[PDB]
Amino acid sequence: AKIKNQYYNESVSPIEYAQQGFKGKMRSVNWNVVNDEKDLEVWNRITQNFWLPEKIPVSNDLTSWRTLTPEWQELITRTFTGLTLLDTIQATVGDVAQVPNSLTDHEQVIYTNFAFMVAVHARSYGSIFSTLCSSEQIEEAHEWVINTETLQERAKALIPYYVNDDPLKSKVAAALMPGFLLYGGFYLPFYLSARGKLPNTSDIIRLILRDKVIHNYYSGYKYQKKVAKLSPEKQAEMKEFVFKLLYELIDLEKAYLKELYEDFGLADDAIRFSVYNAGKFLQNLGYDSPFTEEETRIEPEIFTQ
Amino acid sequence: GHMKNQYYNESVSPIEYAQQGFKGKMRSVNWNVVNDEKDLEVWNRITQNFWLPEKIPVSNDLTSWRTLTPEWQELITRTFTGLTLLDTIQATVGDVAQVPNSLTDHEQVIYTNFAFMVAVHARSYGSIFSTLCSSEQIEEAHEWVINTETLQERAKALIPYYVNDDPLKSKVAAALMPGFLLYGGFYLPFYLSARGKLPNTSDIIRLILRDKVIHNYYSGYKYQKKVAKLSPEKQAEMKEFVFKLLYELIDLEKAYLKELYEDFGLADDAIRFSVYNAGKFLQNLGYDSPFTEEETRIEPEIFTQLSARAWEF
Ligand SMILES: [Ca+2]
Ligand SMILES: [Ca+2]
């Protein structure tokens, strides 16, 4: 039938060579023959979307920052340092753990971009702190992060899936992190910018979100590619896993946001913002969202942000 | 008579949390208190050096490409596909493997940048092929890569260090890849551009090298940082390992370059160019080069291409 690229079936990627006990002829990535065109689309978009926090003049936020009380400034520093922890987990553990579970050679390196870009997300919060926060505010937020059990329980929840040996459960975790877990925190800068506070910070948040949306979409796309090849029984087991894990993380997120926002009255609103994105996460894995309009209500000024 | 950052010592990075059996309070990276200022310097340089192959007008090489015989075009496609293999190894295995062996939280994410940028290096050869090569030339070269044992033996040589449990040997491998193993191949575009052929392709190579130089420097810096704290016995054992592995890779590289360039006469020149960089690799790990001037001689027109300085991102 004159099949093209027969060498591909006669060889292995380098990570497969390592996994199989140092066996097989290794092939180079072939960027001229992309097995799944979606991989090329995603590579192009994520690399075109490269940014660094220094491009945004956060120093122009100083005037509005100084109109916030010490308590609001503390809330922001704590919230963002908690987001930094989740991005640190995804950059150093979660996205790199997806590399060896890839379906294609191109996907392997796409996840190296995801890991690096999430590292940029984590670096960005610190860039904001360098401009706006005192040394004491920064240090107290770090001490609060390590000592706040509701925060740590969310940080601990997904790590075993990345380290253990079930690639589909690891993939679900890899979609859950960008698709759900940081939105309760992203609510805060959008609430503030809707009120004229910290506009340049919200520009950074929007650059972070532009990356996160693609990370969630792409991990959900790869999840569906593998799950569709399973038996109906195993597909049913995996759907039950996804829903059980999501509901577990929703409960952990609710407890955390209630503590984080207790003095400010933002938790119930932030939780609806979070759960709206939980529904988007489910849809990106091929499932219907069970959440009601009232459970997911976002006010127009927030949705504008 | 007469009259900071404690949280850091009470916590662990996420990688350390996993390494300890899921134990400990996890800390966020602190980009406001950087334990080793070298990490901030390197983060700033590598991110400011971000590039993509779209930066270079590779189609302007078409006129000179068409003056090359089919045999030269095949040599170029094969050479670059072999480099793509080494970059694929480093992007997906080698630099990723350095993440959990880091001394600092900032180093953990620096190696994610290294892995991604080496993926860009591999992507860039593909962009060149898209512009210059036929689909048949591209497929031929991939077939040749999988079937050429001298190339495979080099690709195989470093992988066990990345997956085995000696972090210092893995670090040596991570410096040897950018510091040494691709230079015998980079000789070819520089040879061509010194003669007016494929000048834009050599601009891509110089963007790749600007990254590789830092990857080798930084891995050698971290190697020295760890080794300096070890016993005299262990330091001497590691020096012996570095020289033993380097000499083994030099022998594999000589056999490969002799095969790769056998019809063209370039192997003896490319080998000296390679060994010159072997000496630089040793210096970046704190050792003296044992190689002679004759063993490392590079002609001026080639050295100019190697040394020249490398739309916004
Ligand atoms: Ca409220
Ligand atoms: Ca010669």
Author numbering:
A (entry chain B): 2 to 306
B (entry chain A): -5 to -3, 5 to 311, 338 to 340
Please quote the authors directly:
Aerobic RNR (class I) depends on the ferritin-like R2 subunit to generate a catalytic radical in an oxygen dependent reaction; the radical must be transferred back-and-forth with the catalytic R1 subunit, which performs the ribonucleotide reduction. Radical translocation between the subunits proceeds via reversible long-range proton-coupled electron transfer (PCET) in a transient R1-R2 complex. From an experimental point of view, R2e from Mesoplasma florum (MfR2) represents an attractive model to study active radical states in RNRs.
The catalytic radical can be chemically quenched by hydroxyurea, a known RNR radical scavenger used for decades as an antitumor drug proposed to inactivate R2 through PCET. Importantly, hydroxyurea causes a reversible inactivation of MfR2 as the enzyme can recover activity upon re-oxidation by NrdI. To ensure an accurate depiction of the radical-lost ground state of MfR2, we solved the crystal structure at 1.35 Å resolution of the protein chemically quenched by incubation with hydroxyurea before crystallization. The electron density map clearly shows the post-translational modification in the meta position of DOPAY126. The two oxygen-containing functional groups of DOPAY126 in the para and meta positions (denoted para-O and meta-O, respectively) form hydrogen bonds (H-bond) with D88. Strikingly, the meta-O is involved in a remarkably short interaction. Using END/RAPID error analysis, the O–O distance between DOPAY126 and D88 was calculated to 2.43 ± 0.04 Å, a length which could correspond to a low-barrier or single-well H-bond.
